[PDB]
Amino acid sequence: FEGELGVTPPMGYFDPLGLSSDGDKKTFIRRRKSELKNGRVAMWACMGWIVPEWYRFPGELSPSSGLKFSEIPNGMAALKALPTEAWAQMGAFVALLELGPLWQDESRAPGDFKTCAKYGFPMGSDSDPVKNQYSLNSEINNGRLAMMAITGMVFQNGITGTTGPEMWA
């Protein structure tokens, strides 16, 4: 599959364990969609750990609970400190994205969504992979980098037990 949008000079066509030696073009399409989507989630997740360590949103998360954005702990402890109704509404919204706008059409490009723009900007364009081969590769590598990082940050929180300086030496 050398020449597919994901091959980079550092490794060429990586495939060390040989998970795609046979063609299985369906398998590659599914795994590429996972690679892009996991990268985008990881990229948004990686920024989701850095920013609260510097800035916190002004208002209150649940005004009828006293809870304000500041006092919510960062990392994998907000899950048990942010009210369950709050987290359920994020799940409902991500459900809307996965079922509505960000619904991967079969005929479309691997990561193409029929309602989002060139870097994801809401309100969109149909993909032009050949012209945008640079940024499509850039997204995958950044997603690839983010997936390593977010797996790190969560692991750092799991052991150190915080999100402060110790979690990131």
Partner: protein, 125 residues
Amino acid sequence: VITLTENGLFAKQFLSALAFYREGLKPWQRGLEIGMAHGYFLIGPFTSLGPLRNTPEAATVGLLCGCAIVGIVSIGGLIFGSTIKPTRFDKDGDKPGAGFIEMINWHAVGGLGGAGFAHALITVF
């Protein structure tokens, strides 16, 4: 004899789009989807109104019972695939019933996963 609930457009497209019938799904994908549904659902009847429904844990017991139910029905599916041997999921030139056995094994895996995910949601939230 065509009826609305089985031969209507919505009924036909709903039945065809089920995990057991959806076009283009590898057998392990059907098994995984069905197992996730079953494992997620089966936790509830035990962790609530169960023998240890009021214990401080009251959910790990439900998790164990749901995983046990998933394993029992998976064993039944393996019996079915080794006795009846359905061949509608086997790819061409394969051991008869191999597709069904793969579907059942991945149903067991998906049941474990769905049960664990439901338990994780209950404990965390």
